[PDB]
Enzyme design. Structure first.
Site, PDB file in Angstrom:
ATOM      1  N   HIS A   1       4.495   4.338   0.384  1.00 45.17           N
ATOM      2  CA  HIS A   1       5.936   4.734   0.459  1.00 45.17           C
ATOM      3  C   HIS A   1       6.076   6.249   0.551  1.00 45.17           C
ATOM      4  O   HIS A   1       5.110   6.972   0.425  1.00 45.17           O
ATOM      5  CB  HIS A   1       6.653   4.262  -0.812  1.00 45.17           C
ATOM      6  CG  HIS A   1       7.048   2.805  -0.665  1.00 45.17           C
ATOM      7  ND1 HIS A   1       7.873   2.359   0.321  1.00 45.17           N
ATOM      8  CD2 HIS A   1       6.693   1.755  -1.471  1.00 45.17           C
ATOM      9  CE1 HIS A   1       7.952   1.069   0.030  1.00 45.17           C
ATOM     10  NE2 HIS A   1       7.268   0.763  -0.988  1.00 45.17           N
TER      11      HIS A   1
ATOM     12  N   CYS B   1      13.148   6.988   2.718  1.00 48.63           N
ATOM     13  CA  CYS B   1      11.731   6.872   3.147  1.00 48.63           C
ATOM     14  C   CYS B   1      11.615   7.097   4.658  1.00 48.63           C
ATOM     15  O   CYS B   1      12.248   6.413   5.436  1.00 48.63           O
ATOM     16  CB  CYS B   1      11.253   5.452   2.822  1.00 48.63           C
ATOM     17  SG  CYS B   1       9.497   5.231   2.442  1.00 48.63           S
TER      18      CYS B   1
ATOM     19  N   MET C   1      15.545   1.817   4.609  1.00 48.47           N
ATOM     20  CA  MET C   1      15.204   2.245   3.230  1.00 48.47           C
ATOM     21  C   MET C   1      15.805   3.620   2.918  1.00 48.47           C
ATOM     22  O   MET C   1      15.337   4.623   3.419  1.00 48.47           O
ATOM     23  CB  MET C   1      13.671   2.351   3.135  1.00 48.47           C
ATOM     24  CG  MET C   1      13.167   1.490   1.977  1.00 48.47           C
ATOM     25  SD  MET C   1      11.413   1.629   1.545  1.00 48.47           S
ATOM     26  CE  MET C   1      11.623   1.883  -0.230  1.00 48.47           C
TER      27      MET C   1
ATOM     28  N   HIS D   1       9.525   3.925   6.379  1.00 49.08           N
ATOM     29  CA  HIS D   1      10.290   2.650   6.391  1.00 49.08           C
ATOM     30  C   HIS D   1      11.752   2.878   6.763  1.00 49.08           C
ATOM     31  O   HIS D   1      12.599   2.054   6.480  1.00 49.08           O
ATOM     32  CB  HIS D   1      10.231   2.038   4.986  1.00 49.08           C
ATOM     33  CG  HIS D   1       8.772   1.703   4.641  1.00 49.08           C
ATOM     34  ND1 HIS D   1       8.162   2.150   3.511  1.00 49.08           N
ATOM     35  CD2 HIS D   1       7.876   0.937   5.367  1.00 49.08           C
ATOM     36  CE1 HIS D   1       6.947   1.625   3.632  1.00 49.08           C
ATOM     37  NE2 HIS D   1       6.819   0.944   4.696  1.00 49.08           N
TER      38      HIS D   1
HETATM   39 CU   LIG Z   1       8.882   3.403   1.830  1.00 53.49          CU
END
Ligand SMILES: [Cu+2]
Length: 97
Positions: A37, A82, A90, A85
């Site tokens: 992440h 993020c 996200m 993502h």
């Molecule tokens: Cu992420």
């Protein structure tokens, strides 16, 4: 406040997504499932005083269970998310008081 990156069955989202906190609370991000992440702050909606380079995390992370900490102290709003993502949606937001 504790946040879990990734859902518990199949979903990439900041859980919780947005939430307010007192100017003096700790915010620990935790990897629940979906690593690696990433967390950064958009320098376009961050207060003109709280640098976003110090609270951001330009260093990716692929550790299961790994966590980080952040303690804001300026009644306002900070937008984070993020980058990898970002294709799913996200994002993150915190309203300090
Ligand atoms: Cu992420």
């Amino acid at each position: 406040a504790e946040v879990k990156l990734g859902s518990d069955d199949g979903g990439l989202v900041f859980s919780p997504s947005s939430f307010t906190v007192a100017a003096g609370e700790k915010i620990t991000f935790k990897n629940n499932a979906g690593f690696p992440h990433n967390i950064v702050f958009d320098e376009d909606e961050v207060p003109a005083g709280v640098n976003a380079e110090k609270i951001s995390q330009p260093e990716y992370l692929n550790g299961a269970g790994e966590t980080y900490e952040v303690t804001l102290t300026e009644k306002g709003t900070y937008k984070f998310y993020c980058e990898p993502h970002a294709g799913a949606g996200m994002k993150g937001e915190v309203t300090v008081n």
